[PDB]
């Protein structure tokens, strides 16, 4: 009925990602933002397919698909918030009580898609977008895949993600749980998020920062920084064994996750 309710402006870059650009467009009528994700599949049916699964309040709403010949457009939730990476001031963080919020969302979310049986597989704070009210929601399904289905899972074996962020097991092992490796790159974020410093460039045994916290030299930084309650939970996230490592369930009764620390908006 309503007429030309179908054109959108596009009004300026959100970020030019490495398979192209996102874009932010206006509706001309209703004035209602969007993020529209430009891939040129010349330079995804995967990526369309894990977003149409997806609904939950913590994870970026994918709108439809405009295919247009070559030009896969994809119409996403904006998030006006910008990207949780540019809230982490360096060296320094952000208050404790915003991070821990930001943590049970982050939870929240991932919780929302090991239930559904899909594994992100590059959880980092430039993947976690934040909306007007400074809710999180994690972004790009790009490099995200299936691991339950008829409530069977598969192991993974594709080394995928972001080096700083990405579980030991993957680097050393041929097979490995999928759910174990997030709730592991979640803890990085969480470590992000309180030292405003990323702890090693990978987690390698070749890798000497690494081999310190393995050793327990939390007297260094960036675990100096944090405080022994985050700092608890933190050493039962980043533990090497991925059969040993805290799940999700057990995150959610840990002491500083339940921790009071906030006044509400
Ligand atoms: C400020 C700066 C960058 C931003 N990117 C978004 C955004 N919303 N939805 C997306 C979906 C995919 C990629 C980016 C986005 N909002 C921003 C606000």
């Given at each position: 009925?309503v ?22 467009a ?6 209602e ?10 330079r995804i ?20 698909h ?10 996403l939730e904006?998030c ?22 930001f ?33 999180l ?12 289905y008829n409530n069977?899972?598969?192991?993974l ?7 700083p962020?990405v579980a030991?097991?993957?680097?050393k ?5 999928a ?23 990978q987690?390698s ?32 996230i980043?533990?090497?064994?991925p ?6 369930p ?15 908006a």
């Amino acid at each position: 009925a309503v007429p030309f309710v179908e054109d959108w402006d596009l009004v300026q870059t959100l970020g030019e990602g490495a398979y192209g650009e996102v874009q932010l467009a206006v509706n001309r009528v209703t004035e209602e933002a969007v993020a529209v994700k430009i891939v040129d599949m010349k330079r995804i049916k995967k990526e369309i397919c894990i977003n149409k699964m997806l609904n939950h309040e913590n994870v970026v709403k994918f709108y439809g698909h405009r295919r247009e010949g070559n030009i896969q457009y994809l119409f996403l939730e904006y998030c006006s918030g910008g990207e949780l990476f540019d809230r982490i001031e360096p060296d320094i963080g952000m208050p404790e009580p915003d991070a821990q919020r930001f943590f049970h969302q982050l939870m929240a979310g991932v919780v929302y898609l090991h239930g559904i049986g899909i594994t992100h597989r590059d959880i980092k704070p430039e993947n976690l977008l934040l909306d007007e009210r400074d809710n999180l929601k994690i972004s790009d399904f790009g490099l995200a895949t299936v691991f339950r289905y008829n409530n069977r899972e598969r192991l993974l074996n594709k080394m995928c993600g972001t080096l700083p962020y990405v579980a030991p097991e993957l680097l050393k092992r041929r097979e490995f749980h999928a759910e174990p490796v997030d709730v592991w790159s979640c803890g990085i974020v969480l470590t992000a998020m309180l030292a405003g410093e990323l702890p090693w460039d990978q987690p390698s045994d070749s890798c000497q920062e690494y081999s310190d916290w393995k050793e327990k030299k939390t007297y260094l930084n960036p675990w100096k920084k944090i405080d022994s309650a985050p700092l608890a939970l933190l050493h039962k996230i980043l533990v090497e064994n991925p059969s040993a490592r805290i799940t999700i369930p057990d995150i959610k009764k840990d002491r500083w996750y339940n921790k009071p620390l906030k006044k509400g908006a």
